[PDB]
Design a protein around this ligand. Structure first.
Ligand SMILES: Nc1nc2c(ncn2[C@@H]2O[C@H](COP(=O)(O)OP(=O)(O)O)[C@@H](O)[C@H]2O)c(=O)[nH]1
Ligand SMILES: Nc1nc2c(ncn2[C@@H]2O[C@H](COP(=O)(O)OP(=O)(O)O)[C@@H](O)[C@H]2O)c(=O)[nH]1
Ligand SMILES: O=c1nc2n(C[C@H](O)[C@H](O)[C@H](O)CO)c3cc(O)ccc3cc-2c(=O)[nH]1
Ligand SMILES: O=c1nc2n(C[C@H](O)[C@H](O)[C@H](O)CO)c3cc(O)ccc3cc-2c(=O)[nH]1
Lengths: 305, 305
């Protein structure tokens, strides 16, 4: 099974799904539009959380970075009054270097991802959506900037007026991911940001058409009128899509076959039908691995039905 | 006073010299031929040691790196079995980054040094010999490799056949270093490797000529027939230089005025007079900071007389 992942929402669903099926059978196509080179090294926030989740070192308190990771280099620079851009731990920085080096030797992002997987001994198959550069810029009333500067740098406070995912047009679906799609027909769209996470992935040239030939199940990242987290609340509207389990469904309307939103939003059954997808409510507020496991079973069943 | 330095000998003499004259007056021109980019950030071993020496945070046990540094990012990659090249401390890396960020934003090596200086509060004037790149490769009986790979990597065991200081011929004396020679008239050649540390500096175009117009004093880095430490043992001879307090004085023959070698070998003082430099013995073996201050006073007295 193939799973499009963001960096929080989906990896949580994965936290439970990796208890339902066999890991080797789980291939994850991770978003890279959030990637960024910091302090001389490439950081793949999304791609990393997934590696860390499966390598069993993810900090479940915030869902980013390694658990009990030290902050030497960081804290030292904090004393000198120099913000690095994001809290980078020592062990976490190792992932950035280990990867970057490989990239520096001519190898690709996927290559590094592979080596990182083998190093962490993760049975699953993590694969960045694309080897080509893609950056998510957020057009705010204060000025156009990078996602990181907006979310972390500005605490997601700026007033968003637009979203610009650059390079996605010139990017190419990772050959390893295309290869994976061949021997697969079940693709899950984790409950992650539709604009800045799934967006970049489905926006890659050929993807949208490739997703049609497969059975696509999706878990709404919106519970009510707003997301469980993240700036999807400002991005989505300012992007055209309405912040609702209904909007999310319309967004993937071109390929979404089975949808699964939260029960707190029981909505028109025939409404979803007009979009051409089988709806279904369920408890999606993953408050623990058990809830993730519980919702994951609901998902595994969605495919089966 | 201008002072040519390496990363061990000279910064040791400096350790005492900084107790004799007002720091503001100490201008240190460090060697950058040892510089190399590691794990995405530029490292300047010589330039860094001097920075840590005055910022009073240098590890005096090995005389490199920060005192009581942690190694999170290091030990981590160690586990994953990845050699980074050199043991990089976490705080020590913060330096590499801070400097590198400035370099990457359009600033020069010298700029990064000035900022790190104030960031560390050092009053002295630490300046790299040049903003341009220069690397010291050693031709061993195993192939042409980089100094780091030779000394740190191969423990310096490989049989040296020749030394190549690439770039120096196309490098240019740092604008600030030249601006320094404009004001100062006292040049002290610290007791560092005359081939791979001091050499690189006096090899810069138009440099060996500026030394002729100034009062030059040097301290033999070779006590007897071998150096207190450093690969000075193989490099010098394999490069065509006599490994002795005598060969040293001969090397800087074209600009040397006052020479100060160890007392453990009262050489033919008349041999020096017909070498173009006033010899002088002294306990150059710097055991503690007191021995440095002690010797540092003999150096000031040498310039005064
Ligand atoms: N259903 C559900 N959605 C969640 C949960 N936690 C986070 N999310 C959603 O997952 C998304 C976070 O995924 P991601 O794209 O990685 O987030 P970002 O980079 O932090 O903005 C948000 O849109 C949230 O609404 C959860 O426990 N349950
Ligand atoms: N006279 C004297 N020389 C020293 C002392 N400590 C180290 N040295 C010499 O200084 C040199 C080391 O200088 P440097 O270029 O900084 O060394 P590197 O970091 O090993 O490449 C060697 O040639 C040593 O023999 C000391 O206490 N007294
Ligand atoms: O909201 C945040 N998200 C973060 N997400 C990260 C993902 C990585 O792979 C590495 C570092 C970070 C750091 C932060 C951070 O400081 N704040
Ligand atoms: O002999 C050594 N010298 C070293 N010298 C260094 C100088 C720096 O500025 C930073 C790191 C190192 C590390 C080493 C090392 O591991 N071994």
């Amino acid at each position: 099974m193939i799973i499009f992942s963001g960096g929080t929402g989906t990896p949580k669903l994965l936290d439970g799904l990796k208890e339902i099926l066999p890991e080797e059978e789980l291939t994850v196509v991770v978003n890279t539009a959030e990637d960024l080179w910091v302090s001389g090294n490439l950081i793949s926030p999304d791609l990393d959380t997934v590696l860390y989740l499966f390598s069993d070192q993810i900090d479940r308190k915030r869902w980013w970075g390694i658990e009990n990771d030290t902050f030497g280099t960081y804290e030292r620079m904090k004393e000198l009054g120099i913000e690095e851009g994001l809290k980078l731990g020592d062990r976490d920085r190792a992932t950035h270097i280990i990867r970057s080096n490989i990239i520096r030797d001519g190898a690709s992002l996927t290559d590094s991802t592979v080596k990182l997987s083998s190093l962490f001994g993760i049975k699953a198959n993590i694969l960045p959506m694309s080897d080509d550069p893609v950056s998510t810029y957020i057009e705010t009333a204060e000025g156009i900037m990078h996602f990181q500067d907006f979310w972390i740098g500005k605490r997601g406070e700026p007033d968003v007026r637009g979203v610009d995912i650059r390079g996605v047009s010139e990017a190419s679906i990772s050959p390893k991911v295309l290869e994976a799609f061949e021997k697969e027909e079940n693709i899950l769209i984790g409950p992650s940001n539709p604009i800045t996470s799934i967006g970049p992935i489905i926006s890659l040239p050929g993807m949208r058409e490739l997703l049609k030939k497969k059975k696509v199940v999706a878990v709404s990242p919106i519970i009510g009128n707003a997301p469980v987290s993240g700036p999807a609340g400002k991005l989505m509207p300012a992007c055209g899509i309405e912040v609702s389990s209904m909007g999310v469904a319309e967004y993937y309307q071109d390929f979404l076959d089975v949808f699964v939103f939260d029960e707190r939003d029981r909505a028109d059954e025939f409404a979803f039908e007009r979009l051409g997808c089988h709806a279904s409510r369920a408890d999606t507020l993953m408050t623990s691995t058990e809830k993730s496991k519980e919702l994951a079973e609901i998902v595994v069943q969605a495919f089966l039905e």
